[PDB]
């Protein structure tokens, strides 16, 4: 549990944080562990973020996640794994539906691709509004018999949030910029969750700027040119 050097994507100015949900994932985990670590922004290009632990390189973000959760343990470090399996699968198809949506150039497919994104957002909204069994037991449910928990697994950030929140933020920023798409406000559980994340330094201070996320997709997101 020493000598941790994180390497994340650099923004256009060479110093600030670039757009990379996987970089922010690892940045959030390390921060939420309370471990001492340094972070460096580098070009990276198409390469994934990575870290060194006591001078040994660790690669592959999912393997890095397991290594950190197994190496930084109680009592000195908190366990961050979600306790509910549904927390690990909630929202899993959102990024892929968003990507297919912003990449299509045919106006004929836009409505179906938008409904697919909206539906995948709605399943995530349902999970965040359905009370977890401990909330029902604790009678901590909202007056509407709905969940008021702050994040996927409970009121604490878990590894599943470190995965999903960077991607969901990118979806919000990019779908708005390049399709004028708004995550419906009636998705109150999804919006409660995003705003809970925006209120936490661990997300906000590891986040790439709005302009950075939008510019990073300027070649990826396509205009509805063809019919």
UniProtKB/Swiss-Prot annotation:
What are its E.C. numbers?
1.8.-.-
Classify the source by domain of life.
Answer: Eukaryota
Q: Name one GO cellular component term.
A: apical plasma membrane
| Motif G-site per record, residues | 20-23
* Expressed in which tissues: Widely expressed in both fetal and adult human tissues. Isoform 1 is expressed in renal glomeruli endothelial cells and podocytes (at protein level).
Q: Would the keyword Acetylation turn up in this protein's UniProt record?
A: no
All copies of domain GST C-terminal, residue ranges: 77-217
Q: Which GO terms describe its biological process?
A: chloride transport; female pregnancy; sensory perception of sound; visual perception
Q: Name one GO molecular function term.
A: oxidoreductase activity
Tell me what controls its activity: Inhibited by F-actin.
- Disorder cited: Deafness, autosomal recessive, 103: A form of sensorineural deafness with onset in early childhood. Hearing impairment progresses from mild to severe or even profound before the second decade, and is accompanied by vestibular areflexia.
Name of the protein this chain belongs to: Chloride intracellular channel protein 5
């Amino acid at each position: 549990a020493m000598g941790i050097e994180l390497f994340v994507k650099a923004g256009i100015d060479g110093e600030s944080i670039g757009n990379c949900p996987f970089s922010q994932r690892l940045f959030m985990i390390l921060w939420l562990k309370g471990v001492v670590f340094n972070v460096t922004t580098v070009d990276l290009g198409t390469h994934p973020p990575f870290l060194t632990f006591n001078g040994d390189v660790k690669t592959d973000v999912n393997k890095i996640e397991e290594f950190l959760e197994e190496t930084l343990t109680p009592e000195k470090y908190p366990k961050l794994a979600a306790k509910h399996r549904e927390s690990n699968t909630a929202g899993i198809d959102i990024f892929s539906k968003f990507s297919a949506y912003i990449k299509n150039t045919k106006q004929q497919n836009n409505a179906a691709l938008e409904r697919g994104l909206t539906k995948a957002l709605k399943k995530l909204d349902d999970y965040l509004n359905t009370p977890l069994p401990e909330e029902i037991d604790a009678n901590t449910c909202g007056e509407d018999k709905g969940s008021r928990r702050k994040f996927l697994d409970g009121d604490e950030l878990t590894l599943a949030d470190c995965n999903l929140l960077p991607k969901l933020h990118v979806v919000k920023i990019v779908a708005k910029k390049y399709r004028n798409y708004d995550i419906p406000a009636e998705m109150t559980g999804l919006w409660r969750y995003l705003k809970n994340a925006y209120a936490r330094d661990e997300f906000t201070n590891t986040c790439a700027a709005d302009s950075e996320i939008e510019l990073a997709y300027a070649d990826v997101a396509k205009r509805l040119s063809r019919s």
